[PDB]
Design a protein around this ligand. Structure first.
Ligand SMILES: [Ca+2]
Ligand SMILES: [Ca+2]
Ligand SMILES: [Ca+2]
Ligand SMILES: [Ca+2]
Ligand SMILES: [Ca+2]
Ligand SMILES: [Ca+2]
Ligand SMILES: [Ca+2]
Ligand SMILES: [Ca+2]
Ligand SMILES: [Ca+2]
Ligand SMILES: [Ca+2]
Ligand SMILES: [Ca+2]
Lengths: 315, 315, 315, 315, 315, 315
């Protein structure tokens, strides 16, 4: 069972909840504790009904009230939870591209880990939100091999119906070897080609065949053959195929490293995976680092922000 | 029975009808009599087929031919009957906002008296027509408590399935009392919340419970508690709930009241209700005013304009 | 001497005037008389600085305060005064085109009476206001000979430096005669050509010449040759040449004719001429109809609306 | 049976075909013979699958590869085959309008020969491609009777389910006679009216009736009465009714006659009809011209362009 | 003397600097140390010529090369230096609004601290950059009093030529006393009006006059009367009037506060001020915290990011 | 002396000229002979005043008349003559890109042969006409090294005032030798860099230096190093430096070669240069081919089309 850590409130009443939120903001001070309680303990779909009831009740959109009443990471993390999932990811790409500089790790997290269908939903929410084509925007903010990998990812053209086939897999592994390790130069497009088109089951088989023909894993071959964005983007696909839980777990760890948090990263992953597989991600992070995700968050974030993240995630 | 005064013409032939309209315009002179007769005795859906056929037969749109051949109120009323119904109100909203000044009675007649689905259809048609968000244009031409009521109306978020419940009605009646009569200042927000979200049947119940706890009616308190547009909008809601027929009946009277006519308002109600409840409105007007709606129109407008309105309205 | 009736206020202090306007709207109640006083006794240029100081002081634009606190024809005339002149006419054209149906009398008044330079400023104000091209919107709301005349007008191609020449004027007079009276059918384009490109002084000479070679005046020939919109447009140009003062006067009268004021026509001409030739127009108004413009307005309009018009126009 | 000359390839593998295309382009030289082979022997739907897989394997769109690697008519023909059929005709429309002059016969080829459904699909594609309205663009690049025929065509309003009826047909056959032959002037609008609105089977009946009340066929009648753009537009409607295959054969013949080749017309007809009726068109050509379409093309084209076109067409 | 820390490089050769940058990026590896040196030791005006030459030499824009070759805060800071100063602030604004949530402190740093001329340059750059109106976006991402103060700032309508005058200053200060301290409720608007319209010197006087009538300073008074965004915005204007250098000092300090670093904030101020008053800000910072800005950045930043920041700043 | 072949008509009267054009199109048929005469013997600036007067006179644009009244190459050339010169080129680019496929030779003719001033005016005209960025459209329809060359050309960044420097010229010729002839592979970026940024006189000196270190000329090295579009682009630059007249002569000759005519290229070069250097181009053409340009056009074209080309060119 793959599952998230956020469950719909039983005995849901959005009108009451929307009045509850009004109560916390109404007048001097903010009852953030009340805000955090409602947003964290209701599911996204319920949050969407709460948003509807607030606007109808008060003539102001809930997001705007929070933009005014909350600040910093707490603010952002509250607004993230209010986004419909697809919209949240679309806006995350928008911010990754059109802020100061390019957040290329964010683009990899989002575009190198999706199924065809997920990719297409995100493209449609992006068009909807900004009235522009997502691929057009990525090509204006990236270039070279990295750009091409992202363009491949955006077609949603993975042959997801391709069955596992050891013989062909061995053939692809040999072609990958030849394109990288087995030569002085590199045929990068062969790495792009295999990793973007083969079904996840068949890529798993390809990686197993690869380990048979070299003394390095595909992971090591790529790490050694490339650098910078294109290396990270190719690695992210391998990792998402072998263990997506670990991919996120690993990303979560790195976001929280040292005396400072990549708060965008932490918020995006916890929220976006909140109702899909954050339970397994929690399980995997434990095994991988011995420490609970929670304690990691608890000791990296402060105030209400920390309290909200803690409550979505779970112990 | 609730119903309008315009019904589909039998033995309908859209092609013939388009050739008739052409005839009435080609060569020196304009046969307004024939143009009126076609427009007033063919239903909205039939008129759309006439427009398609006219354009296909002549390579010019009917609307553009009328815009050239007709003038003043007759032109507007003819054009108003050619519009699809959701389109008509979209353009009416548009014109109430982006012309000189803000026609707020128009906004109230249109946005305070609709059902959830009704509103949604209007917003959909507005987007279709102006490639803009009705809400965004609304917020640019209004402000304060009036804007917020309009925003609430535009959500289409009334809990239309809320059952009549005397107890809950009294909780709500008291809230509104304490927010208005019961204090020196006002909580308009509570008026907004209740009037926008409760279903019509429970609201009717609420005004009743209100009269049990106050010496004023809801009508009087609202009259006494506010001023201008915000007063008018909330009142418009209470009136639509108790008797939509009355409300429309009234605006008709006001439109034709004065030694001059609010021709804009007259065309809008006559046309937009023509296939829904204008008969009932007719039945009610006569009740409130003794004079029949037709006679009032026959007395207050002239020429082709009058004749068009008369034919749509019926005796 | 040619001059308006509104004159710059002496010892002008925009910051003070904006404070007064605030005080008039702040709290329950609206002091329309102070608002009327500031608006009508300050020049348009001065109004622009008061709008500036009002937004800077209070973080809300003056027009938006007026859109909320004022209504009907008063709101409209007050807002009319706040617009810069090019903007006011560009918006008037917009409203004439984009409302329900077409206000072609509005198009002629504005488009058929201006100088090359006035049309250009209006075209530029329109684009700045709506992003769209004026000529392109006109072509979509009009057709046939009338559309072409307004397109001619939109070029600002009149030969304003063509000097009075009797010989050439007689030739123009002859082609126009042959164009209409001289034949069974018409050469409407010849009417368009001469009336659009000749200078006003030369056109005056051409009309003098026409009445010599014909038993009809150019006015009567046009009346006789054409109908509807294109007839009124060509008529308007002849009247604007002979006496612009009489043209607006007539429009004013007509606007106030019978039992109903075309209030936008009235508002439009009182506002847009207010600082140009409103003085000469009132003079001519008296001459043609025995009553002062003032008395006609005061007898035809009411309340705050009436006060404002009266105060901008003066006795 | 009516059918095209291009059929889906047996044992289709779009990943292999995409790899084949890349091989033909990568490195030194370009293997046009292999490009032609893949394009000409796979169906349009297959080519779409090949496009998706090329972009997914390599991170670059196939069209862009060809835009760089190919040149002249060969590039245009190859790109044409890659377009979805509706997009192809939409783009063909654009290029007929938005280039230097106006390719009016192209506009006739495309808008006067389609069914209602086909017209609606081309319109939607155009709006998809360009974010503009086809009608709106057509009205900006054409005028007069010619424009109106194209506007008629663009409504997709033909009464396609109109049953044959000798009596009503004769009425139209007489009306059309009077609009042209039975006088010195012409009533063009009647030719427009009947030619755009009646079902193809009923028009065919009307052409029959026409011959019974005239000396000249409707073709001859139309030739005589009209000239230029509108004459060819009306003639194209009569031809599409009487012998659609004959029309294209004629156009094809026309493209290749003289001292050159109208290659854009040649490519547009062969490609757009390749999976529709190029077979029957090929037959009719030989019937009318005694020489095969293949031979004519072999005679008139050269290089990979010729090769490509010959392969599409078939002996 | 007030001045920045970056000066034009002597014997400048943009063609050469562009080749230098090319050389640092081509092939295996990246010479970040050479990129840092060109960017930090050439002035913004020199950097613009370097961009022009890079693009002309190589057919790729410098910004795009760094978006690929660089990452994280180093990428951001390098890209920030390449932006023209007006464009930099505008895109800084865009990012404060259109990411996830609102960077309210960024809005205040940029919008409540400029001269009228500076504010108009920023808006013009934004319009050029985003093809949208700055104020429009602002009203969408902020609300209430904080929104109103920002709309005030955007007008650029401060009366900068208002002379210092004790009497008018005592008035303002007394009016300010009554709107906060003096009364139970608050008249926020009075604070908004005085702080937005008064010249900085008159504001200085007005703050003295407040000290004459209250035991609270203007800061204590505002701290006492408000909270959240509007409090911070009003405090910022006072601080900007009293000592602009100390405001940046305090904001830099706070950016590097925690364990920590608001890098977005740190980058914006050092870059935005690098050529204006950073030297004085450097002086002031030493004074306020007894440690140099330099050693502060050094201990708070790492790698090539800190290297660039240290070089821009200087010891 | 460098000059065109079209000179302003003596005793110019645009009103009369417009009347001449109307007459040649009104009624039975068209006087193509009179239209050719006005277009061919008036200058562009005079044509612009003629256009303005026709539209003012008649309320339709001259371009729109010719689009209906003229066809084929004849329509195209007249319309070309009517365009303002910067507009004409922007539209040549547009058509080269947004028709079926890409006309790469036209992009080279236009973008590889201009001064910085000339390119900036073309971009500005393109942005005007299409509300788009020319560089963005270019990158959409080109790729690889050819795209990069076009992007360089679009910066308008040539150091046109670079003094001839023999030491630098020898350096530049040695780096180009090492980037091509000198090694097995190629450093395309170095050809790009030198050919786009150096002044024409310095390039001339560089080409001379090349022949001191190589057995090939620079033309030969490029021919042997590259193929396809990039080769042609680099060659056009070299040819433009050495003798632009010849480049144009050479393209003209190519366009008139074969058993047809690239009328696109012929019209573009004759029109675009008619008032710049077509006289000098005619000489050089004579010198290179032995036959005059006039007789070549005469041999290759027909009808009014040939007539107009011939009259523009002159003997
Ligand atoms: Ca960016
Ligand atoms: Ca290798
Ligand atoms: Ca408005
Ligand atoms: Ca109260
Ligand atoms: Ca209209
Ligand atoms: Ca006549
Ligand atoms: Ca065109
Ligand atoms: Ca935001
Ligand atoms: Ca207080
Ligand atoms: Ca193209
Ligand atoms: Ca080499």
């Amino acid at each position: 069972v793959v599952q998230g850590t956020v469950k719909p409130h039983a005995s849901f009443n959005s009108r009451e909840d929307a009045e509850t939120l009004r109560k916390a903001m109404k007048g001097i001070g903010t009852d953030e504790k009340s805000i955090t309680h409602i947003l964290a303990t209701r599911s996204n779909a319920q949050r969407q009904q709460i948003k509807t009831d607030y606007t109808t009740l008060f003539g102001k959109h809930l997001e705007d009230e929070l933009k005014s009443e909350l600040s910093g990471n707490y603010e952002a993390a509250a607004l993230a939870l209010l986004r419909k999932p697809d919209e949240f990811l679309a806006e995350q790409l928008h911010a990754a591209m059109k802020g100061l500089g390019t957040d290329k790790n964010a683009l990899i997290d989002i575009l190198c880990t999706q199924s065809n269908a997920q990719i297409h939903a995100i493209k449609a929410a992006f068009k909807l939100l900004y009235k522009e084509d997502l691929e057009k925007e990525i090509i204006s903010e990236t270039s070279g091999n990295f750009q091409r990998l992202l363009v491949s990812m955006l077609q949603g053209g993975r042959k997801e119906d391709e069955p596992v086939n050891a013989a062909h897999a061995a053939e692809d592994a040999a072609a990958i070897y030849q394109a990288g390790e087995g030569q002085i130069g590199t045929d990068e497009s062969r790495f792009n080609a295999v990793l973007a088109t083969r079904s996840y089951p068949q890529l798993h088989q390809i990686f197993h065949e690869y380990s048979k023909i070299s003394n390095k894993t595909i992971l090591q071959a790529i790490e050694n053959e490339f650098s910078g964005d294109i290396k990270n983007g190719l690695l992210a696909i391998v990792k998402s195929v072998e263990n997506r839980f670990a991919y996120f777990a690993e990303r979560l760890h790195h976001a929280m490293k040292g005396l400072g948090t990549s708060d965008k990263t932490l918020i995006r992953i916890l929220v976006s995976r909140s109702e899909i597989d954050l339970a397994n991600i929690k399980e995997t992070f434990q095994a991988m680092y011995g420490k609970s995700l929670y304690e990691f968050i608890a000791d990296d974030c402060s105030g209400d922000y920390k309290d909200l993240l803690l409550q979505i995630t779970g112990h």
